[PDB]
Write a protein that binds this ligand. Structure first.
Ligand SMILES: [Mg+2]
Ligand SMILES: [Mg+2]
Ligand SMILES: [Mg+2]
Ligand SMILES: [Mg+2]
Ligand SMILES: [Mg+2]
Ligand SMILES: [Mg+2]
Ligand SMILES: [Mg+2]
Ligand SMILES: [Mg+2]
Ligand SMILES: [Mg+2]
Ligand SMILES: [Mg+2]
Ligand SMILES: [Mg+2]
Ligand SMILES: [Mg+2]
Ligand SMILES: [Mg+2]
Ligand SMILES: [Mg+2]
Ligand SMILES: [Mg+2]
Ligand SMILES: [Mg+2]
Ligand SMILES: [Mg+2]
Ligand SMILES: [Mg+2]
Ligand SMILES: [Mg+2]
Ligand SMILES: [Mg+2]
Ligand SMILES: [Mg+2]
Ligand SMILES: [Mg+2]
Ligand SMILES: [Mg+2]
Ligand SMILES: [Mg+2]
Ligand SMILES: [Mg+2]
Ligand SMILES: [Mg+2]
Ligand SMILES: [Mg+2]
Ligand SMILES: [Mg+2]
Ligand SMILES: [Mg+2]
Ligand SMILES: [Mg+2]
Ligand SMILES: [Mg+2]
Ligand SMILES: [Mg+2]
Ligand SMILES: [Mg+2]
Ligand SMILES: [Mg+2]
Ligand SMILES: [Mg+2]
Ligand SMILES: [Mg+2]
Ligand SMILES: [Mg+2]
Ligand SMILES: [Mg+2]
Ligand SMILES: [Mg+2]
Ligand SMILES: [Mg+2]
Ligand SMILES: [Mg+2]
Ligand SMILES: [Zn+2]
Lengths: 81, 126, 114, 151, 97, 100, 60
RNA sequence: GCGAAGAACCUUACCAGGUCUUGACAUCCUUUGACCACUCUGGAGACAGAGCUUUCCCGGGACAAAGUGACAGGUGGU
RNA sequence: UUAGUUGGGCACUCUAAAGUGACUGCCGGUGCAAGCCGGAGGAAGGUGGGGAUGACGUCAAAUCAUCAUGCCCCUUAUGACCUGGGCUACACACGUGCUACAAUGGAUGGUACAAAGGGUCGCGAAGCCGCGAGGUGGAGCCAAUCCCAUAAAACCAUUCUCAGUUCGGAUUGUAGGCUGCAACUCGCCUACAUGAAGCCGGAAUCGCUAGUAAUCGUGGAUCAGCAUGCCACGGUGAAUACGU
């Protein structure tokens, strides 16, 4: 939602990140929701994101907030011609 | 107060001739305002020029359709036909000058497979 | 003269747009707000007029630090490790357009044939 | 083309100046069907010509055209050799065609300011055998007279 | 005080019933205004001719609709029920006011 | 320089096939002082009875070379197609020289 | 996978934006007119037989 | 600028992971006969676990299920 | 009357049914006939202009993927479902197009003239808000009634002064709008800023015979949203054809 109605995050991922609020922090969150935007609540956690064939890990840092998860999980493999 | 009807392209003009001075009025507007450009004015006068009847009638016209040039031709045809309407004697001069024939030229249909009415797409031989 | 040199024979509305951060519309705003007419040659400007112009211009972003601000934006989005950052590294169209043909004002002139 | 000669399209004489060649000149400076632009840039030219010179504009136009229309012209064809540039007499109609074509193909390139002037001082130059179009006619005449045997 | 609109895909079938209405109306003493031919509406459908290839070859079909209009200004109940119980051939559309 | 567009229907284009086509068609450059830049086009098909068909098209500056040939083997079809192409070359050259 | 596709298309999808249209005689998904709910082939072959009212060949 | 008169998901026929087996789709036999819906929990979703009904309609029909079988099913090939 | 608005009239345009009208018909010459050239009358003269119409057959031309079918093949999978990706990759090469390279122009303000189409799970006006894309609102409309929709070139004024620029717009940074459960790979649009190549394009090559070429806009099918593509409509509107 790129309007002023509000941000967008899938509830089946928001539930996981806010239930991972404990100090344990040893629950790497696996997800397929590439389209979910990154909230400030995500800070600290570590999320594996599906990029088509595997779950690649991303570490949600401070300046990564606001973007979409799928940005950090490339889906094409390019090396050179 | 004698009628006449002129058509050209997609434009229709209803002309009517009254005896009088010669002031020219188009669609409740003056002939110098509605058609401003100087040389787009001699087209209407030619039917009144091929015979020396320049200041013998005032025209009242109601025109619609087409662009500024096309309705000039329509109103030309209309005023000529009205001139024949007033006097059944002026036919030889105008028919001689070819000022009665309606223009049978109309914009042409488009055609499928062609970029216009006759333009064909580019083709290569190298 | 006003942060950087400007042409002399051109009108000030056309001369102020030689600064990295001023264009056709914000120059009009500066000239209208200050009071000078947009049809006065800059060589005909009084000292008080240019004096008034200078701080109005310096309040809003200036040609100097805008370079570093936009460059640090690019550096932030390229150090994060995003798709746009990878494009900025490799030098390819950042906005989502095709690259089989017509990516030339980025990739440069048509390189040597393979 | 292949069946037989085809009738031309008569040009209705222009208003104001009441001539034939003036309308055919207006039709040549036309671009993209813009009649008004050509009309204005020709009437401005024939007015400033009177302002500068003091003569009737049409007289200057005629006495400048009479120097540009060529007579002989080289045609590459058979008869007298396989494309040996046989010089031939241009027909009566072809004269004004070439004259206007050369008058306009060079008034586009004089290059000082708006063409509304570039066409005027080319008519003045043609009025006394100078410029570029007159040079074109002289060059064509020289080349035609070079092949005085292939006729 | 009633207005009748008749529309159909064929003018030949249409106008027979269009007139049938005006005679069946004015025979029972009705002041009726004759049919007024409204503009027809024609639409074009261009479809590729081949099955797989050849976009340059097509075929075009059309569907055109004709319309009429009838007015009665001073009716009587006999005209009303005569028009209402009169039945038209299928192929026309009648919209009695 | 010659640019080859090679298409293979009901077959896969294999590197030795490409090299053979390249060299055989490149032997066509000897008929000109200046080597052209035209796009050579080649099509290869194989039927069910082991018969192979090869089609070749070359748009020269003022000449169009077309040649199709079917035979029991693909390589033989290539060789015969080269012979056909050089035949068109000689025909055109003799005609244009005669029309001097 | 053809006969399953028609069955899926007639079902109700998860969200409205996933709905789409196919021809009704044949199951062709591309180039289907919503006036007739027919493709461009079941329209040509079947307007010739005079089975679509009103529609005839155009010559204007 | 051809099938495509319009690929974010669907389209989609391709790939990765998770799943099903008379089946997503039809005739056909046994019986319950309305299954269906809908609410919540778990999961990325397909799907599982519960709760509410099932007034089927008028022995026939519409549909369903349960196992049940002959069978379907292929945008696979020329 | 805010004005075709209101009462009033179908006179004129207009819509669309039935007819007339063009047939070498007449005249002059020619030929012997078919016919040819010239003229008359006419809105139109020599199949008036344009469509639809595509013979026997050639290329084993194209489509088993629109549909149908012979034979073969897979049948706990070559059948079926779900989420995420891909068809949008990028050292390069070829084809079709759009926009420019400026003064017949750029920018600002004033103002006039169309044809053909679409609209009830639809078109959506006035009014207010916002620089702008747009938001709020709900008038009229199953439409010759209401809406999309006060066409743009053109015309009249002012300014710029031949520069890689007050030409050109790519590329990029920031902030927003709409549709959609969802806009990162992968949508369209807007505002500020940035400001690239490009100064009429080698060999070669394409289109067009009159309302045509050129140029400027408008509508529709597909469609929640997305066209410089496709199919239609009009406005201004030329040059040349000696000849095979
Ligand atoms: Mg055609
Ligand atoms: Mg053609
Ligand atoms: Mg600059
Ligand atoms: Mg700007
Ligand atoms: Mg794109
Ligand atoms: Mg390209
Ligand atoms: Mg095409
Ligand atoms: Mg068609
Ligand atoms: Mg094939
Ligand atoms: Mg050999
Ligand atoms: Mg099937
Ligand atoms: Mg679905
Ligand atoms: Mg859709
Ligand atoms: Mg579809
Ligand atoms: Mg899928
Ligand atoms: Mg349950
Ligand atoms: Mg239950
Ligand atoms: Mg079977
Ligand atoms: Mg009215
Ligand atoms: Mg005779
Ligand atoms: Mg005659
Ligand atoms: Mg004809
Ligand atoms: Mg026939
Ligand atoms: Mg072939
Ligand atoms: Mg099959
Ligand atoms: Mg298994
Ligand atoms: Mg594609
Ligand atoms: Mg600009
Ligand atoms: Mg303006
Ligand atoms: Mg209309
Ligand atoms: Mg609409
Ligand atoms: Mg629409
Ligand atoms: Mg309402
Ligand atoms: Mg619109
Ligand atoms: Mg100047
Ligand atoms: Mg984006
Ligand atoms: Mg340069
Ligand atoms: Mg320059
Ligand atoms: Mg022709
Ligand atoms: Mg002709
Ligand atoms: Mg749309
Ligand atoms: Zn179909």
């Amino acid at each position: 939602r790129s309007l002023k109605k509000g941000p967008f995050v899938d509830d089946h991922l928001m539930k996981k990140v806010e239930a991972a609020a404990e100090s344990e922090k040893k629950q790497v969150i696996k997800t397929w929701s590439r389209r979910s935007t990154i909230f400030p609540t995500f800070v600290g956690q570590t999320i594996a994101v599906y990029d088509g064939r595997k779950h690649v890990p991303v570490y949600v840092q401070e300046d990564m907030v606001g973007h979409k998860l799928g940005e950090f999980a490339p889906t094409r493999t390019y090396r050179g011609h | 107060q004698y009628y006449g009807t002129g058509r050209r392209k997609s434009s229709v003009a209803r002309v009517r001739l009254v005896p009088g001075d010669g002031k020219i009025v188009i669609n409740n507007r003056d002939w110098e305002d509605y058609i401003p450009f100087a040389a787009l004015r001699e087209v209407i006068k030619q039917p009144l020029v091929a015979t020396e009847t320049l200041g013998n009638y005032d025209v009242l016209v109601n025109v619609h359709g087409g662009g500024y040039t096309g309705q000039a031709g329509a109103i030309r045809h209309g005023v000529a036909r009205a001139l024949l309407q007033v006097a059944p004697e002026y036919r030889p001069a105008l028919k001689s000058a070819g000022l009665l024939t309606r223009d049978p030229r109309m914009k042409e249909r488009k055609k499928y497979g062609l970029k216009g009415a006759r333009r064909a797409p580019q083709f290569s031989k190298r | 003269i006003a942060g950087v040199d400007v042409p002399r024979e051109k009108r000030i509305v056309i001369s102020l747009t030689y600064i990295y951060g001023i264009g056709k519309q914000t120059a009009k705003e500066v000239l209208a707000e200050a009071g000078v007419s947009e049809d006065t040659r800059t060589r005909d400007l009084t000292e008080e007029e240019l004096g008034k112009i200078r701080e109005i211009l310096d309040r809003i972003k200036v040609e100097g630090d805008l370079r570093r601000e936009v460059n640090l934006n690019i550096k932030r989005l390229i150090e994060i490790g995003s798709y746009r950052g990878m494009r900025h590294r490799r030098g390819l169209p950042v906005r989502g357009q095709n690259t089989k043909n017509n990516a030339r004002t980025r990739k440069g002139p048509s390189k040597t044939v393979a | 083309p292949r069946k037989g000669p085809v009738a031309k399209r008569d040009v209705l004489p222009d208003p104001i100046y009441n001539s034939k060649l003036v309308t055919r000149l207006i039709n040549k400076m036309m671009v993209d069907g813009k009649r008004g632009k050509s009309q204005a840039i020709l009437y401005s030219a024939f007015d400033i010509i009177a302002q500068e010179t003091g003569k009737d504009p049409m007289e200057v136009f005629e006495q400048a055209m009479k120097n540009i229309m060529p007579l002989l012209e080289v045609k590459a064809r058979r008869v007298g050799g396989a494309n040996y540039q046989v010089p031939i007499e241009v027909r009566a109609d072809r004269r004004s065609t070439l004259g206007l074509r050369w008058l306009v193909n060079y008034a586009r390139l004089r290059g000082e300011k708006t063409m509304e002037v570039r066409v005027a001082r080319e008519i003045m130059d043609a009025a006394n055998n100078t410029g570029a179009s007159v040079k074109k006619r002289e060059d064509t005449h020289k080349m035609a007279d070079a092949n005085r045997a292939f006729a | 005080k009633i207005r009748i609109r008749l529309k159909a895909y064929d003018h030949r079938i249409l106008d027979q019933s269009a007139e049938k209405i005006v005679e069946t109306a004015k025979r029972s003493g009705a002041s009726v205004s004759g049919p007024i031919p409204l503009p027809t509406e024609k639409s074009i459908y261009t479809v590729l001719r081949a099955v797989h290839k050849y976009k340059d070859s097509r075929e075009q079909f059309e569907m055109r609709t004709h319309k009429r209009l009838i007015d009665i200004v001073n009716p009587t109940p006999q005209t009303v029920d005569s028009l209402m119980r009169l039945d038209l051939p299928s192929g026309v559309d009648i919209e009695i006011k | 320089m010659l640019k080859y567009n090679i298409r293979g229907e009901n077959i896969e284009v294999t590197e030795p096939i490409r090299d053979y086509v390249e060299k055989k068609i490149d032997k066509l450059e000897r008929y000109f002082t200046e080597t052209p830049d035209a796009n050579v086009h080649v099509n290869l098909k194989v039927y069910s009875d082991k018969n192979a068909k090869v089609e070749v098209t070359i748009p020269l500056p003022n000449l169009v070379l077309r040649a199709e040939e079917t035979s029991g083997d693909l390589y033989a079809s290539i060789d015969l197609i080269v012979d056909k192409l050089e035949r068109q070359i000689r025909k055109h050259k003799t005609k244009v020289n005669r029309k001097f | 996978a053809k006969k399953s596709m028609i069955a899926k298309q007639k079902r109700t999808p998860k969200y409205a934006v996933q709905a789409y249209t196919r021809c009704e005689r044949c199951g062709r998904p591309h180039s289907v007119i919503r006036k007739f709910k027919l493709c461009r082939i079941c329209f040509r072959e079947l307007a010739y037989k005079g089975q679509i009212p009103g529609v005839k060949k155009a010559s204007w």
